[PDB]
Structure formats: C-alpha cells, structure tokens
Design a protein around this nucleic acid. Structure first.
Ligand SMILES: [Mg+2]
Ligand SMILES: [Zn+2]
Lengths: 97, 38, 49, 41, 177, 94, 160
RNA sequence: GUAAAUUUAACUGUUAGUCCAAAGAGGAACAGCUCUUUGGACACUAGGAAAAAACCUUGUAGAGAGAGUAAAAAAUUUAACA
C-alpha cells in the first residue's frame, strides 16, 4: 500500500535489498498508455481542378513579422547577416553519433 | 494642527485617536490643542 | 553520471529518486520515533574493515 | 592515424540510451480519453 | 525507444504549451514557475544554447492577489526620457490600467537578463479572464497546479466540518451580542 | 554493421503495409492507430505521439511533426520490435 | 471523547505534508526476497539486452556500455590492444531492471571488459601567465598523455 | 617541537608608503587628515562582502567533463483610559 512515488507515469518501480544487504535491486517495467486513455486519429464541374499556386511576395518587413508570429520569435533572428560571419561559419562541422 | 513627535494632552477633553496611520490629539473645546504626530 | 542517467535513462533515474524518497521517509520515521526502533531496511549501513 | 587536435566529449558511445532517451512526455501521466486542459467535452 | 533519429530529436526537443491560472494566486509565485517553464529549466536536457523553452499560457491575470498592503505600497516606475518622463504608479493603478502588466513585469524581472529574454517573453501568453483563444486552447497541455491553496472563506464551509469543529467558549446568557 | 538502424541499412517504402502483412501472417488483428499524446497542433511545430494497438493492447508508439509521419514512425517501431532489431537488443558477441 | 492532546483541525494544527506509513519489516523483507529472486531468474533466463554500467576508473565515473570508447587522461602501463577487466562497477543495469552497489557491486556479480586500443597524447595546451605593469609574462606548452579504451562487453551473473 | 643560525668572501637594489585592528599625540574625542608604536593585509594568487587595495576565507603553482569544504544572503512597526 506504500509506494515512494506515484506508479502511473513512467515505470513500476519496485525496490529490494539482497539478503546480505550489500546491494539494491530495482525492477522498473515500462507503463503502457491505455487504449481508453488514447484518442482516435483525426480525419469545378466543367474545368480542371487547377492547382492553387499563388505566392505573394511580401516585403522584408511584413514577411519578417509573419515569420515571427508563426514561430513565436523576434525579428532579429530573421534579419540577415554579413559576409564576414557568413564565411566564418563552419560548413563542414564535426559529427559524432 | 501642530506637528509634534511626542504627543501631550493639554486638556481633560483632549483625546488621542489613530487616523490614517498617524496619532492625533483632538480637542473639541480648545482647538489650539490639535496635534499631529510626525 | 546522475545527470547522464536523468537524460538518457529515465527509469533508472526514477528508481534512484524512489530510493532517495524512501530513505528520506525512513529518516523522518526514525526522527519522530526517537527511540530504539529497527533502523530501517534501506537505512542499514554496510561496514568495511 | 587520427589528428592530434582538440577532442570534444572524452567518450564516444553509439547507443547512449537503452531505456529510451528523455522526451517531455516521459514522466507525464495520461488522462481519460486524452483530454486537454479545460476541454469542454 | 527504437525511434528513428529525426523523430527522436523532434520528440526530445519539442515544445509544450503549459497552462496556468490566476484567481487569487500570488504574481511572484506565478512568475517563478512560469519563468522556470519559459527558460526550460524544468527539462533535464536544458542548456542555454539549446533553445529549450516552452509556452506558458496564464489566465485570470485580472484576479491576482497580493500579500500584505502591496497593492498600495508597491510602486512601478518608468521614465519617458523627455525631461519629466519619470512616472511612478502604484500596483493598484497599474492593475486597473492594464490587467496583465503586473504578472508580465514580474516574469520579465525573473527571466535572465540576456538576449533570449524577449524570445521567452514572446513565448509567454497572458490573458486577463477565463476567455482563451481557440487555437491556444487546442494547443494546451498540462494545467499546472496553483501555488496557493485558496484559503476557503467561511460561508462555503460545509455543515459537517462546522459542527465537527468544537466550540471554544461558553457565552453568558445575559449578553446582547 | 555495429551502429546503424534497420531502416537506415534496409530502405523500405510502406512500413504500415509490411506490418499488416506480418500481423496477418502471424494471426494478429490489424493494428489501429490512435493519438496517444499531442502537443501544439495549431502551431508550425507540433508533436504527435501516435500509438499502434492490436486487441486494445499497445504494440508501438512513434513521434512526429504530423499525424501521418508519426503513424509511419510507429509502424517502423513496430517492425523493429517484431524483428528484434530494437535499439536495446543484445549487442553482438565477439 | 477528545484525547488529552487532541487539537481541532485548523490550517496549521497538523503538518502540511501527508502522513506516510512505512511497511512492516517482516512482510517487506519477504517482498524484497520475492523481487530479488524474480530479478535473478530474469538474469538466469536472459530477459535483457544491451546492459550499461557506471564504472569508477582513474578517479572518474563513466557511464559505459558495450562497444564503447573512453579517453583516460594518463598512461596506463599497458600495451596497445590489450584486454583488461574494469572491476569497480558502481552500477549495472538494463531494460526493466538495474542493480545498485553499496558502494561497489560484486565481482562475482558483474564484470566489465575493456581493451587498450590507443596510447596517444593530447593536443598542445597553453598555460600562460600575465600580470600588467609588472612585466609579468610566462608561457608553457603541455601535452598530457592519453589512453583510449574500448569497452567490449558487460556481463552479469546470477548471484542475487 | 623543529632546522635553522652565526661567521667568512663578493656586491647590487630598497632607503618619496597605503588602509585596517589596538595604545596614544596633534586637530573638531573632523577628515580617504597629520605624527609614533604593536600586529595584519596590500604593493603575488584565488573565492567572498554588488562593483572593490588595505575587511573575511585561502596560499607553492600542470591536466581532469570527479569529490568534501572554507568565508559567504540584515532584522525590525511604536501611544484608547475610569
Ligand atoms: Mg593617510
Ligand atoms: Zn484641549
């Protein structure tokens, strides 16, 4: 009836001590999300259905505040950078795993 | 009112009341005894 | 390695957090008891010599 | 044969997580029917 | 987890839209927990260069509560830099002018003083009443618990706890009350 | 072979089709996709955790920026789990 | 009848934290025996894969796995490509279970096997001292020795 | 308890000094004032008191993606009198 932590989000943590008392055994099986707790997946007569390719060219300003409103940032991220920094950038960075 | 740091009764009818966070001596018969703590 | 287990191995970190919370509860129980009750299963001290 | 230059991160594993790398929904409980907070349903 | 690399990175570094309520909560405690979530200091993958902030949606900002007399004592000072731009307004005056300015300024003060503060402020969303826009409501995950406990006024005590609490003193029968 | 993923080494086109073929060939009911977890949704940066179930029992879960790619990642996770090519599988004995 | 020491329920009559009762020792030791045993037959059967360990080595603690690389900041008096056993295993574990030493696990319980695969030196490190208006300027170059070990295998044995 | 001291030989350089604690003198029982004495620190490192010479902690030098610590965060809310 006692649990050190709530047992319903990550794993079913059960603690134990060995008979000698020299080591601690932890058993942690994963908790699976219930089906009841889930949610189902959300779902011209005469001419072509012509593809709707309009690309309005917004000027630099209203373009930048549209991007800022879309990505919840400021304008400074979208303003450009000079040749000094652009050539200072490493275009072949090291890559681990 | 006269501004004082220590407040004294100069009459038997003088009374002390704490109003607006400050102590006051009010006298109805001798209004010259009106005193305000600083 | 505690931060490493926190980032990559959340089940082992939850086991460690449960162990720490149980040790804290055992310490609280010993402090309130204040007598000569059994020391606790996880409060036992392994001695070296 | 590798370069004697600065080595970042003095350990290289290719399987850094075995129990699943942490995401925000780890250590997060589920709700009945997956309801959002203050969902009128 | 056996995810592919790009979905695993996306899952690890995705953003969460936490919900927070005003309604007799202290603005400082609201600001503290909101600033932790906005910095992303609640994540074990936190780093200042990792851009791991999360969105915080605070509602009922008009119904905040101040401990003590801070509604009159606390003074917010600004300066429009023309000679004489020094304006000082009490917390009450600032709240009656703008209902979200107090919590906004508290979170802004608690956020770290660098160039990421305005981006975290952009990720913070505040609303004065129960109304929240539908897109944000569809974004919301995890209403966080309130710091205070709503000290529960006398008239909504139930009769069970009222007569479970014993009476302390016996009044005399000859008192007007 | 040591440090690469199964679908990094063997490219596949329809993981959902492969998964339903395997489930029908080992006599398991067809998987149902469900939205286990969801953050955002109206923003440009959503997160969908889509879980694949059979007989109301979870067999896979996958993250994505859209529901469709989350579903395909869940299908790939199910294929990896059924094949034994999971990331936590026993490493090669030398 | 109120006990002599009863306090009416106020906001701070009782401590704010919830009351926590610990399990009785005998049933808890029996539960520990059940958990330790069942984890031991999981080890016996082999219901695990891709073990990890936290190992103390060269005054550091490394979270290593199989097929791993570590860089030790000193020479190790070993030839290249040489198999050794890391023994001071603070922690070992896998999926669904882990084992914790107090502070060290048993050598009969866990082994770590590593291979000396490289004996190199670091990139040159600048040590420079400067104090102004006192003509104080000193420069030194060091190259600390280094040894790259590859963690081959982590093996556990049924001894719980 | 410790390992320095004296002598012999050869010389340079320092000999325009600041704060703090203490005992005093001058001045106003003024001064980041002036003058002696005892002792610190600074004119050499690092951490702290917000920035910081002089206060506190600490000294002997390198690498570490280890650990235990040192000094180290100001508290206060006052007037009824027959
Ligand atoms: Mg002087
Ligand atoms: Zn009078």
């Amino acid at each position: 009836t006692y649990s050190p932590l709530p047992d319903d989000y990550n794993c079913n943590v059960e603690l134990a001590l060995t008979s000698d008392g020299r080591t601690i055994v932890c058993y942690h099986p994963s908790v699976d999300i219930p089906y009841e707790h889930t949610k189902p997946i959300p779902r011209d007569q005469v001419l072509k259905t012509r593809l709707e390719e309009k690309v309005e060219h917004l000027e630099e300003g209203p373009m930048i505040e549209q991007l800022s409103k879309m990505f919840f940032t400021t304008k400074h991220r979208w303003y450009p950078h000079g040749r000094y920094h652009r050539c200072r950038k490493n275009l072949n960075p090291p890559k681990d795993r | 009112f006269k501004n004082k740091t220590v407040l004294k009764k100069r009459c038997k009818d003088c009374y002390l009341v704490k109003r607006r966070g400050r102590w006051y001596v009010y006298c109805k018969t001798h209004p010259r005894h009106k005193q305000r703590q600083m | 390695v505690l931060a490493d287990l926190a980032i990559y191995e959340p089940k082992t970190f939850k086991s460690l957090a449960a162990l720490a919370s149980r040790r804290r509860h055992e310490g609280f129980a010993a402090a309130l008891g204040d007598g000569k009750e059994p020391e606790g299963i996880f409060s036992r001290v392994v001695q070296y010599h | 044969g590798l370069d004697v230059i600065r080595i970042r991160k003095p350990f290289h594993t290719d399987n850094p997580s075995i129990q699943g790398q942490w995401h925000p929904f780890t250590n997060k409980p589920t709700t009945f029917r997956g309801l959002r907070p203050r969902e009128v349903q | 987890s056996s995810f592919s690399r790009a979905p695993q990175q996306w899952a690890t570094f995705a953003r969460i839209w936490y919900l927070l309520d005003g309604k007799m909560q202290p603005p400082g405690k609201l600001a503290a927990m909101a600033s932790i979530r906005l910095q992303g200091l609640h994540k074990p993958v936190y780093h200042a260069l990792s851009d791991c902030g999360d969105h915080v949606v605070i509602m009922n900002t008009r119904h905040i509560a101040f401990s003590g007399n801070k509604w009159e004592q606390k003074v917010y000072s600004s300066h429009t830099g023309y000679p004489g731009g020094f304006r000082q307004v009490t917390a009450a005056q600032l709240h009656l002018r703008d209902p979200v300015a107090i919590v906004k300024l508290a979170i802004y003060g608690m956020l770290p003083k660098n160039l990421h503060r305005r981006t975290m402020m952009e990720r913070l969303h505040l609303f004065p009443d129960e109304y929240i826009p539908e897109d944000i409501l569809k974004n919301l995950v995890e209403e966080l618990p309130q710091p205070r406990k709503i000290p529960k006024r006398l008239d909504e005590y139930t009769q069970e706890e009222i007569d479970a609490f014993p009476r302390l003193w016996t009044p005399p029968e000859d008192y007007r009350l | 072979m040591t440090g690469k993923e199964l679908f990094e080494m063997w490219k596949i086109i329809n993981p959902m089709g492969l998964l339903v073929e395997e489930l029908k060939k080992r006599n398991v009911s067809a998987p149902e996709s469900r939205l286990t977890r969801q953050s955002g949704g109206t923003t440009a940066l959503p997160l969908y955790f889509v879980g694949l179930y059979c007989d109301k029992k979870l067999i896979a879960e996958g993250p994505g920026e859209t529901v469709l790619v989350a579903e395909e990642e869940a299908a790939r996770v199910a294929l990896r789990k059924l094949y034994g090519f999971t990331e936590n599988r026993r490493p090669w004995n030398y | 009848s109120y006990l002599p020491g009863y306090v009416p329920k106020t906001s701070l009559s009782s401590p704010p934290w919830p009351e926590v009762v610990l399990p009785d020792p005998v049933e808890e030791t029996r539960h520990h025996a059940e958990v330790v045993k069942k984890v031991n037959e999981m080890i016996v059967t082999g219901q695990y894969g891709r073990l990890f360990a936290v190992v103390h080595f060269a005054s550091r603690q490394w979270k290593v796995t199989s097929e791993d690389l570590i860089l030790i900041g000193n020479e190790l008096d070993l030839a290249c490509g040489e198999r050794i056993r890391l023994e001071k295993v603070l922690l070992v574990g896998a999926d669904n279970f882990t084992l914790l030493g107090k502070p060290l696990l048993g050598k009969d319980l866990v082994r770590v096997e590593a291979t000396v695969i490289e004996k190199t030196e670091s990139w040159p490190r600048i040590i420079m001292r400067f104090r102004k208006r006192k003509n104080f300027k000193k420069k030194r170059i060091v190259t600390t020795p280094q040894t790259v070990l590859r963690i081959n295998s982590i093996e556990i044995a049924p001894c719980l």
